[PDB]
Amino acid sequence: ASYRSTQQITDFTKEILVNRQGDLPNVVVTPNFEAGVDQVVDQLAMNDSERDTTAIIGKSLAECEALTKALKARGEQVTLIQTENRLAPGVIVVPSFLAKGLEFDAVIVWNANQENYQREDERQLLYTICSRAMHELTLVAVGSLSPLLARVNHALYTLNE
């Protein structure tokens, strides 16, 4: 409640709900799972280069496990977190439900797509996940972008930059 995100992140995230300056959130829509993982690898390298500390937030444990296995096969040091606090201050992969009470410098939202975020009732979840980012926010979607994001003003983020 003391932490606040950049205006860019605040403005993008507020529009997910139907009710500090930094980079516009970047959204990248990719054709398949392996291309999504490419973008995660690339974003981690970009964030590292700007001296960010990044968390990747996946919706569910199963999706986090699939991403984790893939990222390790890209040579990443990955910690699929089981508590907020195990190993490897390199890449944290955080299921949404474990991100409670946490804020991160940079967040990569894993697979913000239609299948994963289809329902009006899921707006609160997607909002909450994105709102964990303090300074840099990236969304990667496999297939199509979540329809919940259609309402967001296109000025508030970049798409496939």
Instruction: Tell me which method was used to determine the 3D structure.
Output: X-ray
CB of 149 closer than 8 Å to CB of 120: no
Could you give the maximum distance between any two Cα atoms of the chain, in Å? 42
Q: Specify the resolution in Å.
A: 1.7
Which residues partner with 28 through β-bridges? 140
Which structure tokens are listed for 61? 């444990």
Any idea where the domains of the chain sit in the sequence? 1-161
Which structure tokens are listed for 8? 């860019």
Of 31, 92, 103, 42, whose CA–CA distance to 67 is shortest? 92
d(C-alpha 51, C-alpha 141), whole Å: 24
Dihedral sign, Cα of residue 68, residue 9, residue 126, residue 160: negative
| CATH class of residue range 1-161 | alpha beta
